[PDB]
Amino acid sequence: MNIFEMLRIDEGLRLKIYKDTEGYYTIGIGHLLTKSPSLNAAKSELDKAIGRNCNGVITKDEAEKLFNQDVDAAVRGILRNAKLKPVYDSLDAVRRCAAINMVFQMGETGVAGFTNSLRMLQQKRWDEAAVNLAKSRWYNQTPNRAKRVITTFRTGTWDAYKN
Numbered sequence: 662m663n664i665f666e667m668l669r670i671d672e673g674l675r676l677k678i679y680k681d682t683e684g685y686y687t688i689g690i691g692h693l694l695t696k697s698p699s700l701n702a703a704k705s706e707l708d709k710a711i712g713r714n715c716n717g718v719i720t721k722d723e724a725e726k727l728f729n730q731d732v733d734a735a736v737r738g739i740l741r742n743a744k745l746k747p748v749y750d751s752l753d754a755v756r757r758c759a760a761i762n763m764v765f766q767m768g769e770t771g772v773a774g775f776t777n778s779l780r781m782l783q784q785k786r787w788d789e790a791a792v793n794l795a796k797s798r799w800y801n802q803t804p805n806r807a808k809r810v811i812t813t814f815r816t817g818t819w820d821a822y823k824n
């Protein structure tokens with residue numbers, strides 16, 4: 662298991678524009694297109710992202726390319742963020758995947774409220790961090806995915822994704 666397999670499990674693969682769990686236009690392996698209610702705005706974002714007139718539909722190769730770019734962008738954002746980088750660098754490789762997963766789903770601004778969780782993770786207080794991570798809108802709105810990510814932080818194993 663690696664970050665790509667982990668997020669592919671959590672996000673699925675759809676080749677036509679769909680709506681994510683928040684109702685926002687998305688495509689591929691969880692690639693957010695826009696928060697605008699305009700499908701035309703989403704289609705414009707898609708064409709810009711792919712470099713051709715897509716009509717709201719992409720190929721698997723294109724979905725995987727966007728996915729690679731999105732994972733890399735999450736990593737580079739963590740590494741540029743003075744609050745996130747020290748915690749990320751303190752983690753083992755499996756838990757780093759859980760960190761990328763959260764940033765992929767909610768962005769750097771979505772994780773800004775997790776300061777206390779981040780401190781517990783840096784302190785390697787895994788059970789306490791897991792309890793704290795679940796006290797969140799994130800956990801309440803996507804509990805099965807949050808449970809998998811939290812189990813990954815709690816245990817440092819892939820058990821939630823093998824199961």
Ligand SMILES: Fc1cccc(I)c1
Nearest residue numbers: 739745748749760763
């Ligand atoms: F960017 C980061 C670093 C550590 C933990 C999380 I959640 C995000």
